[PDB]
Amino acid sequence: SRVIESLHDQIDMLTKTNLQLTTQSQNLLSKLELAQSKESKLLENLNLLKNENENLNSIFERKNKKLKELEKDYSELSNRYNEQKEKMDQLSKL
Amino acid sequence: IESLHDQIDMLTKTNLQLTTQSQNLLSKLELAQSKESKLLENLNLLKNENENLNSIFERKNKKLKELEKDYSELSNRYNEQKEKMDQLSK
Ligand SMILES: [Dy+3]
Ligand SMILES: [Dy+3]
Ligand SMILES: [Dy+3]
Ligand SMILES: [Dy+3]
Ligand SMILES: [Dy+3]
Ligand SMILES: [Dy+3]
Ligand SMILES: [Dy+3]
Ligand SMILES: [Pt+2]
Ligand SMILES: [Pt+2]
C-alpha cells in the first residue's frame, strides 16, 4: 500500500511530462507550418517580381534594337551632309 | 506491482517518442531558419546590384536627353543654313 501510491506518484509525474512534451509538439507543428507558409508566400512574390523583371528586360531589348537603327540612320545622314558639302565646295572652287 | 511497472514502461516509451518528435520538429525549424537566412542573403545580393544597375541606367538617360537636345539644335542650324542657300538663289 505504501508501495502502491508511492508508485502512483510516478505515474502522475510521467503523465505530466507527456502533457508538456505533447503541447510542445503542438506549438511546433503550428510553427513549422508558419515557416512553410511564409516560404510559399515568399516564393510566390519572387516569381511575380521574376515575371515582372523578364517583361522589363524584353522591353529594354526592343528599345535597344530601335536605338541601333537610329545609330545607323544618323551615321548615314551625316555622311550625306558631308557629300553634299563637297559639291558646294567644288562649285566655288576653280 | 508488476502491472504498474509495465504501465510505467509504456508511459516512458510514450514520452520518449514525444521527445523524439520535438527533436525532429526542432531540426525542421532550424532547417527553415537556414532557408530563411540564405533567402535573405540572396535577396540582399540581388538588391544591391539591382540598385547599381538602376543608377547606371539613370545616368545614361541623362546623356540621351542631352543628345535629344544636341540633335535638335543641329537640325535647326541645318534648316537655317538652307534658308540662307535658298536666299542666295532667291
Ligand atoms: Dy530576352
Ligand atoms: Dy549601330
Ligand atoms: Dy532606317
Ligand atoms: Dy566623297
Ligand atoms: Dy525627352
Ligand atoms: Dy549640349
Ligand atoms: Dy529662319
Ligand atoms: Pt554648302
Ligand atoms: Pt544649301
Resolution, Å (one decimal): 2.3
Question: Is B77 inside a domain boundary?
Answer: no
CA atoms B49, B53, B54, B58: torsion sign: positive
Is B19 in contact with A18 (Cβ distance < 8 A)? no
**Chain A residues whose beta carbon lies within 8 Å of the beta carbon of residue B21:** 25
Best probe of the B interface among A15, A24, A41, by most B CBs < 10 A, is: A24
Distance of alpha carbon B65 from alpha carbon B63, whole angstroms: 5
Q: How many domains are there within chain A?
A: 1
Kindly state whether residue B82 falls inside one of the protein's structural domains. Answer: no
**What letters, b where the CB count within 10 A reaches 16 and e where it falls short, cover A59-88?**
eeeeeeeeeeeeeeeeeeeeeeeeeeeeee
The answer as to whether B76 is a domain residue is no
A32 C-beta neighbours (distance < 10 Å), count: 16
Q: Enter the C-alpha cell of residue A58.
A: 524584353
Measured in angstroms, the CA of B73 and the nearest CA of chain A are apart by: 14
Domain coverage including residue B40 = 1-65
Asked whether residue B87 is domain-assigned, the answer is no
B35 close to A39: Cβ distance less than 8 angstroms? yes
